[PDB]
Amino acid sequence: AMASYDNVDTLIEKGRYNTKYNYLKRMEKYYPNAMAYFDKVTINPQGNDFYINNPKVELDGEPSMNYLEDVYVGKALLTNDTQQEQKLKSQSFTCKNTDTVTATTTHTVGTSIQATAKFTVPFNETGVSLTTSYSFANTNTNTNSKEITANVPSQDILVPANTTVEVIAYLKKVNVKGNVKLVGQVSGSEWGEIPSYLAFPRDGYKFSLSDTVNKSDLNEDGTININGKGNYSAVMGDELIVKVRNLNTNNVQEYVIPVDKIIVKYRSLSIKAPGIK
Ligand SMILES: CCCCCCCCO[C@@H]1O[C@H](CO)[C@@H](O)[C@H](O)[C@H]1O
């Protein structure tokens, strides 16, 4: 069906209201002021099997993606005091970075029925999956993180004759933010009693959630669609960059150092400093 409800507690309360209501409306013919006692009549829920079927997290709008401030990893010099161009090698190095995700339910689906669902941050591309989860019934905040260590081998840099180059390594970072909808299909029933008072009979009851709404609002398995909301924000290490600057011309050229495998091992490049050809 097309319809979807954002508060399961409202439905549960209607079912109870209806139960109390019909109990009194039946007596109305005998006692014309019976409805005026609506507040005095007790209803005692005893159990339920309310369940949220197939809870899942769905993106609600496209993620927004912003580059964050670059992480400065280090600086080095490579000096060619020779009359021709030379292949000079940088030192190998490591750097560490933590990928994070935080996720918060902003609008529950009502408190009465517990459910959780997994969320994988989208537009990942790091090769390390980052998952958390959402609670349907509480406004919780779930975090997760993964520490990544980069092993970057020596790089080969062609330096022109009589030139020192300065090399800077830095790590780009992306922030992926957005909203989600928490969806599922509620089934089940509450049971209990309006207890007997004086001459008034006990009414042992069982009401389903699908009975508290119009027949059009139901799916073909009898369930009702529910929806909550949440959001997320993940920080991901992205591209390892090396900028090489020619100290004679002060021109700077940019290179990406690609990943080799998986601890993340990077490739060893052969790169031209500015001033070569
Ligand atoms: C080819 C690129 C060379 C640029 C010089 C990079 C040297 C960085 O070196 C790294 O610095 C880290 C701090 O950021 C330290 O934690 C590591 O131990 C060290 O290996």
Domain ranges of the chain: 1-50+188-222, 51-187+223-277
Q: Any idea what the Cα angle at residue 223 is, between residues 217 and 229, rounded to 5°? A: 80
Q: Is 191 helix (H, G, I), strand (E, B) or coil?
A: strand
Q: Any idea what the Cα angle at residue 28 is, between residues 27 and 30, rounded to 5°? A: 70
**Over the range 169-186, which residues count as b (16 or more CB within 10 Å of their CB) and which as e?**
bbbbbbebebbbbbbbbb
Q: Is 198 helix (H, G, I), strand (E, B) or coil?
A: coil
Instruction: Determine whether the shortest distance from the Cβ of 240 to ligand 1 is under 6 A.
Output: no
Q: Atom of ligand 1 at shortest distance to CA of 155?
A: 1
The alpha carbon of 95 and the centre of ligand 1 are apart by a number of angstroms equal to 6
Token pair recorded at residue 187: 């089934």
The alpha carbon of 130 and the centre of ligand 1 are apart by a number of angstroms equal to 26
Q: Which residues contact 248 (CB under 8 A, 6 or more apart)?
A: 160, 162, 163, 275
The alpha carbon of 244 and the centre of ligand 1 are apart by a number of angstroms equal to 15
**How many other CB atoms sit within 10 Å of the CB of residue 83?**
8
Instruction: Determine whether the shortest distance from the Cβ of 213 to ligand 1 is under 6 A.
Output: no
Helix, strand, coil percent content, the chain, rounded in steps of 5: 10, 55, 30
The alpha carbon of 94 and the centre of ligand 1 are apart by a number of angstroms equal to 6
What CA–CA distance (Å, rounded) separates 33 from 27?
Answer: 9
Instruction: Determine whether the shortest distance from the Cβ of 152 to ligand 1 is under 6 A.
Output: no
Instruction: Determine whether the shortest distance from the Cβ of 92 to ligand 1 is under 6 A.
Output: no
The residue contributing the CA closest to ligand 1 atom 2 is: 169
Among the CATH numbers 3.50.50.60, 3.60.110.10, 3.40.50.460, 3.30.360.60, which is that of 1-50+188-222? 3.30.360.60
**How many other CB atoms sit within 10 Å of the CB of residue 199?**
5
Of 118, 46, 29, 71, which Cα lies nearest the Cα of 237?
Answer: 71
Q: How was this structure determined?
A: X-ray
Q: Which residues contact 239 (CB under 8 A, 6 or more apart)?
A: 171, 172, 256
Instruction: Determine whether the shortest distance from the Cβ of 93 to ligand 1 is under 6 A.
Output: yes
Instruction: Determine whether the shortest distance from the Cβ of 90 to ligand 1 is under 6 A.
Output: yes
CATH architecture of 51-187+223-277: Beta Complex (2.170)
Instruction: Determine whether the shortest distance from the Cβ of 71 to ligand 1 is under 6 A.
Output: no
Instruction: Determine whether the shortest distance from the Cβ of 257 to ligand 1 is under 6 A.
Output: no
**Radius of gyration, alpha carbons of the chain:** 32
Instruction: Determine whether the shortest distance from the Cβ of 88 to ligand 1 is under 6 A.
Output: no
The alpha carbon of 125 and the centre of ligand 1 are apart by a number of angstroms equal to 24
Of 70, 132, 60, 137, which Cα lies nearest the Cα of 97?
Answer: 70
What CA–CA distance (Å, rounded) separates 211 from 272?
Answer: 73
What CA–CA distance (Å, rounded) separates 232 from 238?
Answer: 18
What one-letter code names the amino acid at 200? Answer: F
Hey, which of 94, 149, 155 would you mutate to test ligand 1's pocket, going by the most ligand atoms within 8 Å of its Cβ? 94
**Alpha helices (runs of H) in the chain, residue ranges in sequence order:** 8-27
Longest CA span, the chain: 115
**How many other CB atoms sit within 10 Å of the CB of residue 236?**
25
Residue ranges with strand state E in 108-195: 116-120, 131-135, 141-152, 156-159, 163-187, 189-194
Q: How far is CA 255 from the centre of its chain?
A: 32
What CA–CA distance (Å, rounded) separates 55 from 46?
Answer: 26
